[PDB]
């Protein structure tokens, strides 16, 4: 089937729930060998995890899950990830090698619906000061963090900084890490790195920079320990709905720009290079 329609309509249908799919978890999935998932199959297993209860955070195919002694129970139904790559296929008429870029499919089932898996595979209180850990993670990011009394929390493009208020006036440092590090996604899109304002001229006013920013911080906050604020979204799910509708492949590239941001901030504050 269209996998880009299937993933978009279990995505319209979460949302039109009032629950969009990457707000589930309030755990990042995992595959068999430890890695994570990344894009838009981390949004869809978090869904898939909500919706039917599940607690592990590793999914494996059939074979992987046998390979390890586990067996899918009967009646398990598994779910479906995407794999995008190249393959090379040839001209006909000449026999010309050309790789074409393709969309495929995969099922995969959670742990909790295996039986015989090795036992491996069966939030930080914060209170109200600033936190050092959180902290030099922020600072490591690179971003320029200025705090006023001004009681709004926003990433200035033009002077490329991020607005902070007072720690003390959220009675939450929670609340606080989990606002910086969402301007901090926004601001992992400024033109000198991952310049999503240039590439992405939203002329249809479809909020999509809102959009990755939302998903990149449910990402970013599940690898921190901290719980994302979707409070400050409700003005843009309609448009998000329309855009969804308009564009079966609109939700992939959002989570794939939502990841990248993500992975701007750790890897800058892991000093990572080539």
């Not at 981390?42 to 590793?58: I, N």
């Not at 139904?77 to 000449?94: A, H, L, P």
Request: hydrophobic letters at 35%; a negative charge.
């Amino acid at each position: 089937f269209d996998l880009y329609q299937h993933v978009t309509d279990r995505i319209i249908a979460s949302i039109e729930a009032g629950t969009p799919a990457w707000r589930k978890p309030w755990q990042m999935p995992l595959r068999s060998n430890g890695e994570a998932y990344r894009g838009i199959n981390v949004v869809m297993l978090w869904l898939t995890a909500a919706e039917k209860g599940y607690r592990s955070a590793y999914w494996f195919t059939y074979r992987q899950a046998k390979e390890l002694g586990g067996q899918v129970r009967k009646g398990e139904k598994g779910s479906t990830v995407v794999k995008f790559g190249t393959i090379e296929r040839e001209d006909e008429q000449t026999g010309e090698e050309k790789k074409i870029p393709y969309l495929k499919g995969y099922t995969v089932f959670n742990a909790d619906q295996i039986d015989g898996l090795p036992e491996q595979y069966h939030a930080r209180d914060l209170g109200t000061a600033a936190d050092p850990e959180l902290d030099a993670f922020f600072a490591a990011t690179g971003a320029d963090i200025r705090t006023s009394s001004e009681p709004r929390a926003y990433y200035n493009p033009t002077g490329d900084y991020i607005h902070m208020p007072p720690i003390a006036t959220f009675h939450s440092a929670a609340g606080y890490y989990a606002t910086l590090a969402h301007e901090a996604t926004h601001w992992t899109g400024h033109k000198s790195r991952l310049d999503r304002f240039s590439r992405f001229s939203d002329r249809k006013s479809y909020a999509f920079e809102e959009l990755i920013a939302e998903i990149g911080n449910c990402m970013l906050c599940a690898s921190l320990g901290l719980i994302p604020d979707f409070d400050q979204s409700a003005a843009y799910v309609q448009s998000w709905l329309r855009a969804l509708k308009d564009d079966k492949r609109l939700i992939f590239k959002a989570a794939t720009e939502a990841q990248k941001a993500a992975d701007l901030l750790q890897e800058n504050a892991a000093n990572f290079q080539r």
